[PDB]
Structures are given as structure tokens and as C-alpha cells.
Design a binder for these strands. Structure first.
Ligand code: MG
Ligand code: MG
Ligand code: MG
Ligand code: MG
Lengths: 156, 202, 125, 137, 189
RNA sequence: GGCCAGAACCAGCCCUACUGCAUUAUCCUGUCGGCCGGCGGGCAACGAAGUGCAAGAAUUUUGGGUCUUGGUGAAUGCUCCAUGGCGA
RNA sequence: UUAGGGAUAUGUGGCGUCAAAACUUAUGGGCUCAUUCGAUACGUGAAAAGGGUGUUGGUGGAUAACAAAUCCACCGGCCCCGAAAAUGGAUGACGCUUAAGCCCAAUUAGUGAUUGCCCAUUAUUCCUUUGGUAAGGGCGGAAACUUGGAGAAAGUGUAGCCCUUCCGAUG
RNA sequence: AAAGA
RNA sequence: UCAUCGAAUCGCCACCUACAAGACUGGAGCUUGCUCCCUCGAAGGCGCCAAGUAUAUUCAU
């Protein structure tokens, strides 16, 4: 019995995680800049990375306002974003995680895209059975209206 | 009337896939298998050729036409790996086996039977690829028999291209939707555009 | 012409497409009286608890049109098709299995691999 | 305390008036609203109304229904005691004409009623890919 | 006596660690011995000991002093028993959920305090929390409160046992687990 | 009568929230530099756990006769009276 | 370690399929490629030195030059050979190798203190039997809303005098 | 297997 | 002689899942594939029961 993401929709796929990871050298991906964690008990949060300790393991934190502690989260559920603060080209791994994040790099990302999908899938998990109707009359609307537009294309 | 979950086996490791297919056949589902050619096996080809030439060496001494009948043609090597992962000497297990088909490549009767399926928990590439030697099962079975590697390597070439004739023809039929569905916004009630955006389906 | 759609408005289904994995068992053999059921999307042992107590139905046909419910209140309903009934009593393992306890007489074994109906009632929410 | 034609033992979600999800019987999938619980923990007396769904004043049990968290905030009369349910409808449309004339009104009252009037008309379907154990209600 | 003599225990361990002393935790007076391996092949000296501890079948937790004579009867049968020092919270959990008395040679559940005084009669042991205080401390009526009870037929611990063949310190579970038998009896009561 | 479903008290397995409850040190400052040494006062404990008290309330299952009743203000006591709902 | 059943929970053993359980764990620390890898004790013992110019670990002692790093000696295997038979051929089978191997750990994921999970003639609890001569109590007429018994007979033994209570139960 | 798609 | 078990359906699946262009201009599009879920679409408008609380959906190819 297959849940699908096409192509090649998948048998026997647990709906509580994925084996996303493809191996990469640690240094290029991340450097005490910023990252987000897919699979954590706190779910899909982003915390700027304080430092790298050993290999897979990282120390991941965030200033406040998210109930995110300074903690040891592993790269196996911690995946970089290109909204860095202190990785790569910028001269150093920075300190004062709030002030460096007071450069709105998180505030910009939290209001930019790929975070409107984080809460999208978290909205479809808190949508009670009334907004699921709202979502179905919303798709059904855009659906047939799409068909009306196709009819217009046929006319053209 | 029936419902077949037409699985696919490109880049599926021969054993992490026959274990998953067996338990689903055994859960009463009717799996059809295609592209058993591209099934992979761990280890180099030499090691996998000897792990099979040592099996092609076993036969009933007194009457070989009763001995273990070895099969080339990965299509049934995959059936062989499944039958062995299965309760054969019950009618429960013989029904489960007889629900596979396990073709070679994508035959014409299962190219137009709907979208097909892969098993992510068996794809050999849940992660990075290091260097390690894998063996396409259709290339290991060419070397122990299975005269028909040329055959299916061309039938599936006259298809991977004949399908590609239909992805670019009827390509101007696709954007007749992803645009019509795109501009299916801003003409319709904002009542509903807001909840499409809310739940991301915008 | 304006193209229609197969928009499938028919008598809805309030069931889940369970299926008998088998019976509870060890290596020492089999203990009937307690079935196992795979339901779709039920795969976490914390959502297979949402089903503990839900009535469960193995639908099968015999060969004779025996009696049944509303044999006279609905002579249109009488058919060669029967149904067994149990309730999900417990989860099983940590991958969304569940133990079903059919009412008295256990489920047959022409039911393994074949469809089970896990109805949403008696609801709990 | 209570030993009398009262002492409801419902769930907190199952309210005196709240949109429901009928799970079995004639009208399964339909979304009648609860109107009342019968005394002595009688079954619920949900109605749709009929104008939207087809469900009349009907006795269904509390365990054969899912209570959606959205309400209608009913303010009708208490004119449906445990009779009817004594013993092409002859003499119950009196209780149907009145309560329907109270429901459609009661939905025009509450906001999003333009939807919650079309929300009732919908059937609940278990799609092949859905997960009710996942869902809130 | 519980609330006081624990508070008084803290201060004597406050004045010690502060002003440059060590407050040796006095001693556990009472042990709680559970037989964790069955009636299979057993050395006859191992077997007679467990007959005098009333550990006649698997999971028969018994409260037991730790005199010099006694704790050597535990030394000798450790592969079979799994003991430790019982918390107050685990002594009454035994007595209330699983406590049975020896009324007239029968295993009579402790259903009311009236069942207690008729059985002990010993001018001191009236209620059930009173059997606990006789068991929690080494007591003056301990050979009376315990011997007046049946060994605590218990359930196998939920969640399981790590092993049963290796000592508690070598990854298995038997012998002495100082104060960690509460996490082991909680799953059994 | 047999077949069900639901309900209700009993005990039982229980759902478990908040978890408080004390302790212990964690940690609060000072100027130093890409090999680091120049240290002190506990007055803070939400990521201190070898540790104490919790029901209403979640579940099927199982059994149903010598009842229930009303709250008071202190430092918990008087007490009174005699299963239903389907299908077949 | 064993009366007949139900449930709850474990033991040993496990959780890729056969095969119930990690629907292949969000597993974590390293190890491992093995042209017969390796993989459940006791089955009988699997492989013995030996070395290397091999993959990973550790200690003695140079240079600041090997042909800005590069050495001289060994300890430690995983692993390579040393090593072989006769029906076809066995980890139990398939199969697994960015494990389903090995050694350590784990148990809902560094968020906050418990039982990850599956299997018994075991344990706990629930009924039912049966024995103990195991304890009791009645051992001839009264009421709790519907019947049963604290009215069924002075009794080893039953279709037990009646209840209810404990405990044991293989051979 | 079709062929359309 | 059929009363059946089953319970999304495809000219938007279904070469390819991934190209092309960033150690800092976004590309995305060779896409969480569509559509499906109660009147062909959102705003209404409409009949439904007595099939008398669950009972294989008394539907549906
Ligand atoms: Mg899981
Ligand atoms: Mg064990
Ligand atoms: Mg069990
Ligand atoms: Mg590993």
C-alpha cells in the first residue's frame, strides 16, 4: 500500500520520518551559521549552529522566543539552510547568537519561503474537520475553474 | 475489477526488495514486478557470479530433471528469491507466490496500466554513494545464461524512447494546465484563495 | 465539448481497509482467538491505539443465503454475503498492528491476506 | 446527586448543538448537528436539517458519531422529549417543520454559515489515502 | 516519624558537607528479597536457604532484616534472589496492593484494619500503616509482622528484566541493588 | 429465549496531565592574549535527579440482592427510611 | 517445571522474509569487504604457528629533512595467505554488506526521571474442577424487586447437607 | 495483448 | 443455475526527477501529478425520512 510522492510512488513508507540524508563533507555544508532540524521532538525548528563537535554531532541553539535550548543535535536530523549567519564566505563563526540573529536573517527566513511550507504541513496537521472542508471547496473551486480556463484555451 | 500495485525494481537491492515484496504478497496484495533486470546486489560481479555458479553446481545426482531447477532470466530469479522468502508448502504461500508476475523491463501490458511504484526502504541509495561495487542483476545473469539480455535491452530501448516521444509530445498539453491552474487564481473567490495559501496548496 | 470528470459521488465508506496479517503466534505455533490487522496509514503504535475498541468486520460470502440482520425488515438486503465482527483490543508491536477479538468464535483462516473492515465506531472523540 | 431524566454522561465535545459526523446507519457520512441528548442518557436526537442532509429528527447513539469541534449554537425549543419514538411520514413533520425552521435560521446567524450550510451537505468519506487517527475533529 | 527523621537526616548532612565533615549514611536496616529465578536445578544449600526465606517460587519478594546472620543467607543465594533496600513508598505498595496475612493458615488479603489486629494481637500492631512502620524500620515487631504475612506473590516486572543470569553490576540483574530495587518493585507491584 | 449495540455503578487494568515536595552542585562577577594561568563570597535555581503525593478521569473486559440519602461549624461526628434498545 | 480456561506481564530466545515482534528502529560509537566474508553457547572444533611490502589501534625512540612534514622497532587484531577432499549442500533457508555481520550501547531521540516490542503448561489476576480432612459458618423457615437463601438432611465418601475460604494440582 | 491515449 | 469477497479514478500519472547559472543575483521545472471527498461550484437553490439507535454500504463496474 503506497503513499505517493511521484515519480515512482513508494510502497511501505512510514509516515513518521524519511531517510533524507546524502553524505557530504561537514565543513562545506555548515559552520556555526544557521540550520533547521526535521525530526526532533521540537519539530522543524531552526536554530543557528553554535559550533561543530566531532563529526555528525553539532551544538545547535537559538537565542530565545522559541523554547529552544543550547543542545547537541545530530546532523542526522539537522539540515543546512542557505540563510547562514557565520558559515562560509562571511569572515568568522560569530558569537552573541541573538545579536547576529538580530540581523533578521532568521526573521527574514521565518517570513520568507520554505518556512511558509513548514507551517503549511503543520497547518494541515492542526486543520480541524471544518477547515478540511474549506480546503476541499478551495481545491474544488480552483479545480473546475482550471477546467474552465482549459476550455478557454481550447477556444483560443 | 482488480487492483495491482505494479512495483518497479530499478536500483532496488535484490534482497531488501524480495523481503518487502514477500511480506506484502503474504498480506494478500497482488504485486506485479517490472525491470528485474536492474535489480542490484551487493559485492562485485565476480563474487556474485560465483555465489551463483556454486548454485548452478547443485543437482540431483541420480536424476537432474528432478534436481533444483536453476533459473536464469532475473525475472524469475526475483521470483526465486521471493519463493524462498515464503511459506511454500501451504496453499497460503502458493497463492502469495502466484500473485507476483515479475516481468523483465516494462512489457507493453504494464506500461499503460497506471503509474508504478518503488520501495524506498530498498533502493541502495538512501544516502550518499561511496564507491562500492554493485551488480545489475541483468548483467550477472547474462553471464550464467539468459540468452535474452540483448532482447530486453532493445525492447526497453524502443520504449524508454517511445515514452520519451510522449513526454514531449503532449508536453504542450501539460502547461495548458499548470498555467490554466496557475491563472486559476485571482479570477475566483478570494474566499478560497486564502485557504489554498494557508494550507500551501496555492 | 466542456469535459466532465469522474468525480465519484457514491455511497461513502466509513471503514478502513484493514487486512488479517495472521494470528498471534510464536515459534511454538499459533494461538487463535486473537487476530492481527494491518490498517493503512496506521503505522506508529500511538495511532493504532486510536483504534482500540473500534468494531471490526471480516466480510465474506457463503454459498447459501442464510439468515442475517433485518432478514424481513429489508428483504432487499438479504444476500449470500456474511460478516464477522470483532473489536480492536490492543496494539501489536510498534508499527501499527492491532489485535482484534472476534465475537466468540475466532476469525477463520480463509481470512488471512483478505480484507478486514475497521469501522470508525464506536467513536471515541 | 443525579438519578433522574438528566445526568448526561456525554463527552465534552458532544455538545447540545454541534455539527456531527454520523458514522453508521442509513445516513452515514452525513453531517447532522446534535440537537439534544435524550434523558436517562438516551441517544442523541441529531438532525441535519433534512433540507441540507436528509437526516430528520433521528435517534442515534453518542458512540456512533464524531463530534466536530465546530458548533452552530442552537437556540430552538425543547419540543422533542423521549416521545416521539413511540412504537411517507404521517405525524412527525410537525416536529420537522418547526426545528428545520429553527436550524437554517440558526446557521444564517452564526458566522461562516455560508460555508457551514454547505459544510453540512457534505458527506464524510474515508479516502484511500487518509488517516483519521492523524486528524483533529 | 518519617517527615521528622528525614528532615533531621538532611541537617546532619547539612552541617557535615558545609563545615567540613562527612555524614556517613547510617545503614539500611531492612532488605527486600525477591526470588528472580525459578524452582529449577538448585544446590540443596541454595534451596534450603530459600525455604527459610519463604522464597518458594519466582517473584516472592519478602522483607528481611540485614543482621550478620541474615545477610549471609543472601550472600549464598544471590544468583536466585534480587534484593535491595526498600523505600517507604515501596514498603506500603507491597503491603497494600499485595499484602496477605496468615489468618488461621490461609492467605487472607488485607482488606481492613480489623483483619490485622485479630491476627497480630500484639498490643502494638493495629492498622496497616503500622505494619509498614514495623517493616520500614528494623522495628521491634519485625519477626512478627513479616512472619505473620505470606511471601508477596508478585507479578513479573513490566518492561522486562535485563537478564537474570548475571549480577546487577555486570549488566544482568540479581544480587544487591542498593535502593534501585524500587525501580524494580514498582514494575512488579 | 438466542443475536447484538449502547449505557450505569462495582474493581481491575488504567489515560495521564501538572508534577509540586526537599536536597545536591550546576551558576551568578574581574581585567588578560591565536602556549592559556592570576582567584575569591552562595545570595539564583525553569534542562539537578539514586527522590516523595494525585483523583475526578482513558479502556475493554467481568459481576449485578441485605441500598441510598443531607450538609453544617469546630478541634470528622447525630442520621433517616424502601437495567433499558434492536434485529431474528 | 507441568489440573481446565481467559486476561495482564515476563523468562530463555529474539524483532529483514520464512516467523509473532524495530511495517528495515529518526538507532547511536567504532569496526568490517572477506575470488566460501561473517553471523545463537554446548553440539565435534574453526583452524596452529608464521610473516609481510596490508586496512584500523597503541608505545619506545630522530630529523624542522621524504623520494613542512617525513622516520628507524614492535604491541593488537578485523582481515590476506598457512589449510584439501569424495552424492548436490548448507548461519536453518533465502538473503544481507553506505547490514539483516562483529563488538559495545540503546529504547522515543541531548525535551524534563517509567514498561521499545513479540512469544510459555512460568508469574500475576480471574473464573471452573479436584484433593487437603485445610479452615470456617450454618447445619429449618425468611423477605430483598426479584427470587435464593445465612430454611433444605448433623454428613468420610454422591447428583457433596448448604454456603465461602485458603492452599496444592506433572509423573 | 491491443491500439488509442 | 449468480446471491458474492473486493471499495478512488486518469488525454494534468506514465523520458526524467531532475537539468542550466551561485564556495551570494533568484532560476525551476523534466512540479508534495492530477483531479476525487454531495449536487460541474460556491453563492445558492432543492427533494431525502417509517430503512422507526450499530448490524456486509438495503450503494456502486
Ligand atoms: Mg515507527
Ligand atoms: Mg531476555
Ligand atoms: Mg499478552
Ligand atoms: Mg552502525
Amino acid at each position: 500500500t503506497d503513499a505517493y510522492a511521484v515519480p515512482l510512488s513508494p510502497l511501505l513508507s512510514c509516515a513518521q520520518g524519511i531517510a533524507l540524508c546524502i553524505m557530504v563533507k561537514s565543513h562545506y555544508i555548515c559552520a556555526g551559521r544557521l540550520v533547521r532540524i526535521l525530526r526532533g521532538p521540537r519539530q522543524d525548528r531552526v536554530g543557528v549552529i553554535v559550533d561543530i563537535v566531532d563529526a555528525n554531532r553539532v551544538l545547535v541553539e537559538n537565542p530565545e522566543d522559541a523554547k529552544m535550548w543550547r543542545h547537541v543535535q545530530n546532523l542526522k536530523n539537522v539540515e543546512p539552510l542557505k540563510y547562514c549567519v557565520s558559515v562560509s564566505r562571511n569572515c568568522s563563526a560569530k558569537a552573541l547568537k541573538d545579536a547576529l540573529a538580530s540581523s533578521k536573517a532568521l526573521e527574514k527566513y521565518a517570513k520568507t519561503r520554505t518556512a511558509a511550507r513548514v507551517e503549511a504541513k503543520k497547518a494541515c496537521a492542526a486543520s480541524t474537520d471544518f477547515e478540511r472542508y474549506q480546503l476541499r471547496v478551495a481545491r474544488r473551486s480552483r479545480a473546475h475553474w482550471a477546467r474552465k480556463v482549459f476550455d478557454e484555451k481550447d477556444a483560443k | 475489477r482488480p487492483e495491482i500495485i505494479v512495483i518497479d525494481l530499478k536500483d532496488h537491492v535484490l534482497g531488501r526488495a524480495a523481503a518487502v515484496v514477500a511480506k506484502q504478497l503474504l498480506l494478500g496484495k497482488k504485486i506485479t514486478v517490472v525491470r528485474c533486470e536492474q535489480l542490484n546486489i551487493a559485492g562485485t560481479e565476480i563474487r556474485n557470479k560465483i555465489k551463483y555458479l556454486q548454485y548452478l553446481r547443485k543437482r540431483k545426482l541420480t536424476n537432474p530433471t528432478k534436481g533444483p531447477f536453476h533459473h536464469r532470466a532475473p525475472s524469475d530469479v526475483f521470483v526465486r528469491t521471493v519463493r524462498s522468502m515464503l511459506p511454500r508448502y501451504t496453499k497460503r504461500g502458493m497463492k502469495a507466490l502466484n500473485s507476483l508476475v515479475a516481468y523483465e523491463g516494462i512489457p507493453p501490458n504494464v506500461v499503460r496500466t497506471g503509474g508504478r511504484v518503488v520501495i524506498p526502504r530498498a533502493q541502495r541509495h538512501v544516502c550518499y554513494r561511496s564507491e562500492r561495487p554493485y551488480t545489475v542483476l541483468g548483467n550477472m545473469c547474462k553471464h550464467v545464461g539468459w540468452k535474452y539480455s540483448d532482447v530486453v535491452a532493445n525492447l526497453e530501448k524502443a520504449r524508454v524512447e517511445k515514452a520519451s516521444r510522449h513526454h514531449e509530445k503532449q508536453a504542450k498539453l501539460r502547461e495548458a494546465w499548470k498555467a490554466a491552474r496557475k491563472e486559476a487564481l485571482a479570477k475566483m473567490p478570494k474566499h478560497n484563495v486564502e485557504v489554498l495559501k494557508k494550507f500551501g496548496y496555492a | 465539448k466542456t469535459s466532465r470528470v469522474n468525480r465519484n459521488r457514491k455511497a461513502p465508506r466509513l471503514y478502513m481497509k484493514g487486512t488479517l496479517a495472521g494470528y498471534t503466534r510464536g515459534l511454538h505455533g499459533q494461538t487463535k482467538q486473537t487476530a492481527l490487522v494491518r490498517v493503512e496509514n496506521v503505522n506508529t503504535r500511538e495511532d493504532a491505539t486510536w483504534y482500540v475498541g473500534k468494531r471490526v468486520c471480516y466480510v465474506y460470502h457463503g454459498k447459501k443465503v442464510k439468515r442475517c440482520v433485518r432478514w424481513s425488515k429489508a428483504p432487499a438486503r438479504r444476500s449470500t454475503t456474511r460478516a464477522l465482527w470483532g473489536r480492536v483490543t490492543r496494539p501489536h508491536g510498534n508499527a501499527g498492528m492491532m489485535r482484534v477479538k472476534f465475537n466468540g468464535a475466532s476469525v477463520p483462516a480463509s481470512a488471512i491476506g483478505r480484507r478486514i473492515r475497521v469501522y470508525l465506531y464506536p467513536s471515541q472523540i | 446527586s443525579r438519578k433522574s431524566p438528566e445526568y448526561t454522561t456525554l463527552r465534552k465535545s458532544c455538545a447540545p448543538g454541534v455539527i456531527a459526523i454520523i458514522l453508521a446507519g442509513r445516513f452515514r457520512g452525513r453531517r447532522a448537528v446534535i440537537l439534544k441528548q435524550l434523558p436517562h442518557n438516551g441517544p442523541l436526537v441529531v438532525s441535519g436539517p433534512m433540507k441540507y442532509n436528509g437526516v430528520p429528527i433521528r435517534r442515534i447513539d453518542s458512540r456512533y458519531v464524531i463530534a466536530t469541534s465546530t458548533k452552530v449554537d442552537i437556540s430552538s425549543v425543547d419540543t422533542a422529549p423521549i416521545t416521539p419514538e413511540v412504537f411517507v411520514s404521517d405525524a412527525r413533520a410537525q416536529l420537522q417543520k418547526k426545528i428545520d425552521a429553527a436550524l437554517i435560521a440558526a446557521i444564517k446567524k452564526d458566522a461562516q454559515g455560508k460555508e457551514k450550510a454547505g459544510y453540512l451537505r457534505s458527506v464524510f468519506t474515508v479516502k484511500p489515502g487518509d488517516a483519521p487517527h492523524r486528524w483533529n475533529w | 516519624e518519617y517527615r521528622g527523621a528525614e528532615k533531621k537526616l538532611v541537617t546532619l548532612r547539612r552541617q557535615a558537607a558545609s563545615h567540613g565533615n562527612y555524614y556517613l549514611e547510617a545503614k539500611p536496616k531492612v532488605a527486600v528479597v525477591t526470588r528472580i529465578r525459578g524452582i529449577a536445578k538448585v544446590n540443596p544449600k541454595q534451596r534450603k536457604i530459600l525455604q527459610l526465606l519463604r522464597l518458594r517460587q519466582i517473584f516472592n519478594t519478602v522483607f528481611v532484616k540485614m543482621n550478620k546472620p541474615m545477610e549471609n543467607m543472601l550472600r549464598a543465594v544471590e544468583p536466585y534472589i534480587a534484593y535491595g533496600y526498600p523505600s517507604l513508598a515501596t514498603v506500603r505498595a507491597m503491603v497494600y496492593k499485595r499484602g496477605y496475612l496468615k489468618i488461621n493458615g490461609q492467605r487472607v488479603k488485607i482488606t481492613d484494619n480489623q483483619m490485622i489486629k485479630d491476627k497480630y494481637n500484639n498490643a502494638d500492631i493495629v492498622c496497616a500503616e503500622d505494619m509498614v512502620n514495623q517493616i520500614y524500620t528494623c522495628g521491634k515487631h519485625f519477626r512478627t509482622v513479616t512472619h505473620g504475612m505470606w511471601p508477596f506473590k508478585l507479578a513479573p516486572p513490566a518492561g522486562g528484566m535485563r537478564q537474570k543470569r548475571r549480577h546487577f553490576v555486570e549488566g544482568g540483574d540479581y544480587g544487591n541493588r542498593d535502593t534501585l530495587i524500587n525501580r524494580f518493585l514498582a514494575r512488579m507491584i
